[PDB]
């Protein structure tokens, strides 16, 4: 998650710094947050122990 979250952090960060007409809404972060949560749920859903 640290790898996934950091990668999305740069995307959300670059849009913050280099956007000429950024709206103070955080939409890019919010959609980015959804992707990380989806990765988290699938990553956590897996169980190493055999069932």
């Amino acid at each position: 998650i640290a790898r996934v979250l950091a990668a999305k952090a740069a995307v959300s960060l670059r849009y913050d710094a280099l956007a000429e007409d950024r709206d103070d809404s955080g939409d890019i972060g919010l959609e980015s947050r959804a992707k990380v949560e989806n990765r988290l749920s699938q990553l956590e859903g897996r169980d190493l122990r055999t069932t």
Partner: protein, 422 residues
């Protein structure tokens, strides 16, 4: 068989006899509220006192709990020991316990159910005897802490073998493993019987239907590749859908709609099954929210049909039922909304149904055709029938207008039907 194996069977049968002090310590230590050390020190009177108060609070929430104050939570139940009871008496006891687990199924979020249930765990040892019912009622709370406590104090049946690893484990059972448990066919028959009892008793609630639907939907997804295993699922889960449609509760009906749709897209089915499927959907369709979901299901089912008669007219009995539960104005609204799903095959079968059985709605056919674009073959079938109508039925201003509509759109195809017919 070895002597050890037979003794193991003897050990299981006498699991709750409490022969000696050590056996009493294990049986009495099992608890949902207290740790092992404090649990052993407690007395049956103390446990009953808390439960008696707890059941009273539950009775305030729902009056039905008050009945069990007469049978399971009576002062005389303290002296009642299951081992010394005869076979007939135990079955009578199990019926009362099974009924209680249904009421408590929906209130596990409330603390009093945990105190009300502790009496049954300690006194009647349901966690050893009625383990299947307890797990099934609490199956949908699998991510809650209370389910974790249940797994710790419970010996798993053969069918619940997938949950063994999550016994006394920090992580709660994952959603993926819950699919694996439902994947087993024997479990589905077991769950279907339990779900059948809930329908009979009107004991269902939204959380149960949501969780039950997902596992059923997910199971079809996991078996999508295997056509043979899908064929084995059809007798069971469709039979469930028939029961769900029978419930007067609207939430149960919507679940049947959700379940039915996934099979039709997952597996093509005979038009006889699809036709019968509608009749059950429309027979008990009263709630508005069910009516919305149903109409979405009806069109989706036809879309899966891919055989001769794909767009043939509905039977006379079916058409009358559909019109009663869905007036023409309602569908004209359905076709009106821009986000309507693909439903052309149903509209074609519906359109041909109108001509055969109703002459007054012929103006409605013109309105419908404008709203939704039908595919080339479907247009040809409609023109073929309306040509027959003109020869049999009297020529009407609306009838010629429907032709005139086809004259405007794709005039050449109108000749082709006329050439083939006359």
């Amino acid at each position: 068989s070895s002597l050890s194996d037979q003794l193991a069977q003897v050990a299981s049968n006498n699991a709750t006899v409490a022969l000696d002090r050590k056996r009493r310590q294990k049986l009495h230590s099992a608890s949902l509220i207290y740790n092992s050390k404090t649990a052993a020190t407690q007395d049956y009177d103390f446990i009953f006192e808390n439960a008696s108060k707890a059941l009273e609070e539950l009775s305030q929430i729902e009056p039905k709990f008050a009945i069990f104050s007469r049978t399971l939570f009576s002062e005389s139940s303290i002296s009642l020991d299951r081992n010394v009871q005869t076979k007939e008496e135990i079955k009578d006891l199990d019926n009362a316990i099974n009924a209680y687990l249904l009421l408590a199924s929906s209130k596990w979020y409330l603390a009093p159910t945990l105190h009300a249930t502790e009496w049954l765990v300690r006194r009647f040892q349901i966690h050893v005897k009625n383990t299947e019912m307890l797990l099934l009622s609490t199956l949908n709370y699998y991510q809650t802490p209370v389910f974790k406590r249940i797994l710790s104090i419970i010996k798993l049946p053969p069918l619940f073998n997938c949950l063994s690893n999550f016994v006394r484990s920090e992580k709660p059972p994952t959603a993926l493993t819950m699919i694996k448990l439902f994947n087993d066919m024997d479990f589905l028959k077991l769950y279907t019987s339990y779900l059948d009892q809930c329908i009979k008793h009107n004991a269902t609630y939204t959380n149960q239907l949501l969780f039950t639907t997902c596992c059923f939907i997910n199971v079809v997804a996991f078996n999508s590749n295997n056509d043979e295993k899908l064929n084995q699922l059809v007798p069971i889960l469709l039979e469930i859908s028939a029961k769900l449609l029978a419930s007067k509760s609207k939430d149960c009906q919507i679940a049947a709609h959700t379940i039915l749709v996934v099979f039709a897209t997952a597996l093509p089915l005979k038009k006889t099954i699809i036709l019968a499927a509608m009749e059950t959907i429309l027979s008990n369709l009263d709630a508005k929210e069910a009516k919305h979901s149903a109409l979405l299901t009806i069109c989706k089912l036809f879309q899966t049909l891919k055989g001769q008669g794909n767009v043939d007219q509905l039977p006379s009995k079916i058409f009358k039922l559909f019109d009663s539960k869905f007036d023409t104005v309602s569908i004209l609204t359905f076709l009106d909304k821009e986000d309507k799903p693909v439903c052309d095959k149903f509209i074609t079968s519906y359109t041909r149904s109108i001509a055969r059985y109703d002459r007054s709605k012929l103006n409605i056919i013109l309105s419908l055709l404008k709203k939704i674009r039908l595919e080339r073959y479907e247009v040809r079938l409609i023109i073929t029938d309306l040509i027959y109508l003109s020869e049999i039925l009297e020529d009407k201003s609306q009838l010629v207008e429907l032709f005139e509509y086809f004259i405007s759109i794709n005039e050449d195809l109108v000749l082709k039907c006329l050439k083939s017919l006359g």
